[PDB]
Amino acid sequence: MKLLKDLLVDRKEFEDWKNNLTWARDGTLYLTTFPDISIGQPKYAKDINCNSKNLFHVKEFPLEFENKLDFELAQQNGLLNSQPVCYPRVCKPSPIDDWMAVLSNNGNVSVFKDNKMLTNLDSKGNLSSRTYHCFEWNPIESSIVVGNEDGELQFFSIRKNSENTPEFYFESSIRLSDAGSKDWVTHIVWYEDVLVAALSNNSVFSMTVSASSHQPVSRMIQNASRRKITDLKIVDYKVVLTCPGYVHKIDLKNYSISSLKTGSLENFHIIPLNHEKESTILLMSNKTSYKVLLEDELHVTADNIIAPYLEKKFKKWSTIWNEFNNYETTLVIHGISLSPDGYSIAIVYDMERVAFKYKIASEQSFNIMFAPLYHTWTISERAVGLAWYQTYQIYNQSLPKLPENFSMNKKLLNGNYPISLDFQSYLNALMKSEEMRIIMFLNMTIDKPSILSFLEALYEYAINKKSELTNSFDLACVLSIAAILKREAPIYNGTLLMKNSFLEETFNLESFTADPETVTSTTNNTWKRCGVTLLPILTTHVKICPVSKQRVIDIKRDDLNDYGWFTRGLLERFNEISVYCGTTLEVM
Amino acid sequence: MVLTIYPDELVQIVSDKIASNKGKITLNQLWDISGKYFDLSDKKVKQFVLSCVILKKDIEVYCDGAITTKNVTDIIGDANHSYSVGITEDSLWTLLTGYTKKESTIGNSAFELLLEVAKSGEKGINTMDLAQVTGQDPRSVTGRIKKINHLLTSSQLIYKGHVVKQLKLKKFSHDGVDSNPYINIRDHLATIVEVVKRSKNGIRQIIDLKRELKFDKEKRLSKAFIAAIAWLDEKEYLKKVLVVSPKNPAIKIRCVKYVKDIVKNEVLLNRFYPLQNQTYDIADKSGLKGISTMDVVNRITGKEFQRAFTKSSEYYLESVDKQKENTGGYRLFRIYDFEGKKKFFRLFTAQNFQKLTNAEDEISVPKGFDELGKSRTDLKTLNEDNFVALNNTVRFTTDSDGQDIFFWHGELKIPPNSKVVNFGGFSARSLRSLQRQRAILKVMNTIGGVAYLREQFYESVSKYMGSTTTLDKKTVRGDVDLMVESEKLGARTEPVSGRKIIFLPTVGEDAIQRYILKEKDSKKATFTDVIHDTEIYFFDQTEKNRFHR
Amino acid sequence: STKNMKSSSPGSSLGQKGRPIRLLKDLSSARDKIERIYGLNKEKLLLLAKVKEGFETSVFDFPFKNIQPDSPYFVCLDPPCKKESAYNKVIGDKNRTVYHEINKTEFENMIKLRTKRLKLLIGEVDAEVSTGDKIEFPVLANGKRRGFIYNVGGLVTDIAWLNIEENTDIGKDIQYLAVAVSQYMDEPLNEHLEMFDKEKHSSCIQIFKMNTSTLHCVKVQTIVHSFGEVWDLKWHEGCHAPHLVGCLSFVSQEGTINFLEIIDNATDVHVFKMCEKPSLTLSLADSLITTFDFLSPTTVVCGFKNGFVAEFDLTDPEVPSFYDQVHDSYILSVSTAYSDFEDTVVSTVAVDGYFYIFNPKDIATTKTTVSRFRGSNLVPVVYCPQIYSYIYSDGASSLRAVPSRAAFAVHPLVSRETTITAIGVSRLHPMVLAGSADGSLIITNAARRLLHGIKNSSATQKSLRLWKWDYSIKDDKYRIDSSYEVYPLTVNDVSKAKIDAHGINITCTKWNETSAGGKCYAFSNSAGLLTLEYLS
DNA sequence: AAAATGCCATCTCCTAGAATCGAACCAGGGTTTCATCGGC
DNA sequence: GCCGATGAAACCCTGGTTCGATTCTAGGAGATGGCATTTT
């Protein structure tokens, strides 16, 4: 496969040399640059010209930090509040939900949806208990764990307030460190039901975490050691960790340790190859990479996946900047992330001479490279929307594997419509169907997106409860859907009155059968239709699908129109996510 | 028919016409845009259309240029005033660049160019008119275009006799082939040589090759092809020859003949001495020559520390204008010098600089000591006399048990216990200017004290300087003006040619008139080598006929 | 950008007021300033009360009594290398330093110290001082001064006192000084002094035995070695054994940290020794160590040419505990801030101009920026433990203090006419020696700058020129000016750099850090004139 | 009532990043000179 | 065959382009003084 051209990012700095890249569920890149986070905002184009500049728009993503500790005096960690203006150190997006969490330089973990802080995580206790150095999202359910300077894990769970906004509340804690110890929690990895954490003394603990347990038993799986843990990962219930000169595998069924000695003291990042049959990782440093098989004894093989591309790039750079080998030169990695589906890897890098050096921000540049890890891919439920499209462009527009004889003629839930459900449960059952993910992806591959399979699933919920379509907006919607599907409609004759703040437009209900893009009012004014409900857009208060360019009525900015249970249910359920492609809607 | 669009699509279309009109439009232009898409005859639709546009956060409305209170029903009814619609600067930056003014890496000057390129629309603007319309220096305009070129499409054009770039916003890129694709003869030299190389005897009739490569299509391409053959002859990739016809020896034609086809860096920086002393040491070891800031950086730190070195060396290097206080002993002077186009500082130790600027003056007496300090107070007296009391704050006391207990002041009752350099007659702004001025005068003594200030003179000075770089007209006339101000040259306009003549003030009028008379009717365009009794390969039967005649 | 919320420490003056503090100017109350910088630990505040009452009046000089253990003001804050007997852990029959004795002819073949006598003018004495001679200070004006100047015979790269109080075979008044000496003198851009790549050549360390009461001084050993130039010269104050003077540690142009056993002579008769193999060498493949400090009697933190930091265990030195990139370029100095009340933290400054403080437990989550400087080859950083502050230069004429917590609270101490090149601090008192490229040595009290309010800083803070070197080009002669000069702390001061004689820049200055010798300090210029003064 | 604390305005210096300016170089077009053709 | 006119080629001129280091400007940081209010 031939790679896309690297995304050149200019005039951005990192404070440090750890892994500063995360790749969100929706395809967003988060780079913990200094002093603000940078987002690679996902973008759709039909042709990207094999250039990744067309998949991402990279911009400054400024955030407001509330320091819950700025009236606390520092105690044993003298570097707390040593620089009182907060800035982000670590940023992890949720593997499930719309939001991200950010660790500040002063040990606060704050959750954000868009630029807005949801919660600043806190529980009552000593200052060391309230100062955080790592966090991890629950991979299965909406919860987050933080690690503090007491060497305990604190678990926080979401609950939703009157506005259906989430609130994080302290659930429970587990102490890992010895009583009166000063060891901090430095790493946390949560994989399925298994949670692994490392202390600043480089002891490692495992736990099994569940809804069925309030405080699970921890087990120490590696004793304390001077060798600082570099990276920690879980692969098929095997803990893999790297430290100077070594990689260790801990089997979480046998608690056996096997270890392998690296030929280098550079930091190795661990890249789990989750979709191989055999249990494997890539190890990657600034200098080398390897493919390790997590057998009973760790076996080393050549990295035939990523090394060839970085070698080829470094040889071109060396031709321009290190003719005659007059300089010592290095690749520098600033971040490595798997894609949310795990099929692709993103590497943010630059290439440097070892030299006396004094850069300013305007002189900074780095490249992010995207490469496929496998020969084939699938439409993962760990990814949404433009994430699938990114994984399609990587892999050189090769389609994913699909079910046998699949076609966009296929009905959602194979026509086993759960009509007995409440309408929000019903819409959730459709949107979680396997056929819907496939159709939403294929809509990004074809010239004109289509939702005929979804409109049938709505029509079957509308000829059932046919007696409850009393409302004029709901009738105009179902009559439009019936006209698209070419079927019987509940009533033909009557009127819809629809309003904005300046202009009131009356439509004959009969006119909703005439044209699929437009509808003409009794004044002969002609109006575009809403993508989701097929009602006329009389307003700029709309959200735009970034792929299909369909406009959706924004139910949250229309107080004037008396939308019934059906049209309101659709416009409430599809206020944020495109029914066409699963992409987040853009806001006008 | 009235086109149907979304109301938000209208607001984008209006915004993309406020951008591309330098950030503002009249209200009548908004009716011309929106009248294409909405029936403005209905007062309620006209109010709705204006509301879509002006209730957007980043749109401003002005009444007679003054920002006004967005009363839609007033603005549409009010005939008494002129209304206009603009946008916030960050909206204007976002529409044109995709980033706000703060975040965009483009720069104000490149954004003034992008605003004029955007206002030009599908017609576009050429780089020469773009410079004149914005009033930006042509020396900077094309460097600024490089930083916005990702937002543009461009093609080469000839305008007022110069090759220029036509510029448009990238949305006006056309996939169709150009009607007038710009051809430069200098791109085809390899083809011209290869066609001569592959010709039967390695020779072509020049007019025949001009016709075969179809460069006869334009007087420009005719001149350009001839200049390319002349350049390939001058650089001896080809050679011009005259071929006498073997069929009629009275007939000669101008021909061209084939000739040929076209372990470590060590940095000396140490941690033991201040950087200014390390800089002084190689400036001193360079001697009367001086050393460039480029060589100082390469030898001490390497190129990646150039900026840090420059910011540090500003504190201890002295320009000849605005010198620092005369410490004596150790001083580094800096002056401009040139390496072709690059202007950089050479560094000189003050001894070597004095020998350079004032070569006739006495070499300076070496400095001894300064006077000693004349204070005789002892450390005890100074310690007692310079005490100022601190703030009270932290305190302690010893208990009767002998335990020391901490307290803050006031929390126990316990009371307190407490610009042209002279160079000996040649005024110059750089060492290259000084070298050029002395080279001009030395050539003028050599070639007989009078010269027309033409290209033949600029080569004579370039040769005497040993310069591989060739002197520009504007450079030599710059030095000649300095040498006239210092009365080392005379110069005047020659009445008939209008060329500037320079002459040594020691050279008489009779010599200047005889020089003009000797230069008049000086023969040029002289004939090339001759060839006989041999065939020419011809593309054109009319050229073959003229050779056969 | 940022906002506060009301959760607050008990007993805090800051907590009672509720004012959000972002800059040093916000700490307009003297109790709030001390409380924000040092915290509320009563045992820590008791030590600062003892430093305050014991040294508030000591603007340029301090009484000898306040550094004796029987004083109520005695605060001796031993460095982390001293906290245990390391010798049997770090050294033993597996790790003895190997020497052979050489004669003066073999020494002179390997190391060409200066043969031409230096012309020295001091007070009214004009003298030619030969290599290895000293001149005692004459009857100067401005009071009797006790001390001497020694002509070491080469470029003095570093010096180090051995801070023993007493030993079974070292009586109270005796002290040892190690002096590192280069033969590549008189040439500021000599090829062999390069910073950036591995260089090996013969240099020497001279060991001096000095009596603090008589100022009798004897060079007892010269160690010839092939490590190149050496700096961060430190005695491992934890490695003591009956047969040693002590264990001496340094980084070298070889790019390694080396530990020598300095084996005590039978007699003060001078011996020359060739160091064949040190007791311990710390190194990595394909990077050079450029600076180090102790974290522990058995662990060191070190900086590299490539901008990495490592920790080494001195009991298992082959592989470092961590090896992380911290800077973009060559690390100039690394310095350990130690406290009985806070986790140990490490500061680093590099050629890229950044000054960082981090905790080696977790560099990623603790790395704090103090400031960016203008970019420089020479940025001295030392930890002054009595005020829990790093004392450092810009690399450009300003001397500053920053507390190891509250990196925002930078205090300027004094501004010079030129590059500051050396800083000296003591565990026993808050007095700072700073040496400069113009050959001036100043003294200032850093606990009058910290432990005081923000208002009227320029009126309360002063420094004194103890000495100035001058060089006469006409005479080829060095002069040392004894006359004292008072400098107030300057306001809005322009950064200054000037070029002075290559010989007069002060390369190093170190206090003796013992109760018996604690008023002695030594300083050297590049010419190799080592001056000791017993300040009294 | 006096000293301390808090905040604002003004002044001075620094640093980053953008803008300037000289010189060379290059191409096109005008001008000038030379050669050839045609007319006497 | 010679002389005059035209056309054709060569040479010179003018302005834009190109490039990079140094210079300049904008924005921020830090300190003091003054004034007012609070605390001792």
Residue numbers in the entry:
A (entry chain C): 1 to 588
B (entry chain A): 1 to 262, 322 to 477, 538 to 668
C (entry chain B): 137 to 672
Lines quoted from the article behind this entry:
Transcription of transfer RNA (tRNA) genes by RNA polymerase (Pol) III requires the general transcription factor IIIC (TFIIIC), which recognizes intragenic A-box and B-box DNA motifs of type II gene promoters. Saccharomyces cerevisiae TFIIIC comprises two evolutionarily conserved modules: τA contains the C-terminal region of τ138 and subunits τ131, τ95 and τ55; and τB contains the N-terminal region of τ138 and subunits τ91 and τ60. To adapt to these naturally varying distances, TFIIIC interacts with the A-box and B-box through its two subcomplexes, τA and τB, respectively, which are connected by a flexible linker. Our study addresses this gap by determining cryo-EM structures of the yeast τA and τB subcomplexes bound to A-box and B-box, respectively, in their fully engaged state in complex with a tRNA gene promoter.
Specifically, the yeast τB subcomplex includes the N-terminal region of τ138 (aa 1–668), τ91 and τ60. The high resolution of 2.46 Å for the τB–DNA subcomplex facilitated the accurate building of 40 bp (+37 to +76) from the 3′ end of the yeast tRNAHis gene. Specifically, WH2 interacts with the B-box motif through residue R139 contacting C55 on the non-template strand as well as G55 and C56 on the template strand; residue S140 also interacts with C56 on the template strand and residue H162 interacts with G51 on the non-template strand. In WH3, residue K223 forms base-specific hydrogen bonds with G47 on the template strand, a region upstream of the B-box. For the WH4 domain, residues R366 and K370 interact with G60 on the template strand, and K400 interacts with T54 on the non-template strand and G55 on the template strand. However, eWH’s residue D591 interacts with C52 on the template strand and K593 interacts with G51 and G52 on the non-template strand. In our τB–DNA structure, subunit τ91 binds to the downstream region of the B-box with residues K591 and N628 making base-specific contacts. Additionally, τ60 in yeast contributes to DNA binding by engaging with the phosphate backbone of the B-box motif through residues R11 and S362.
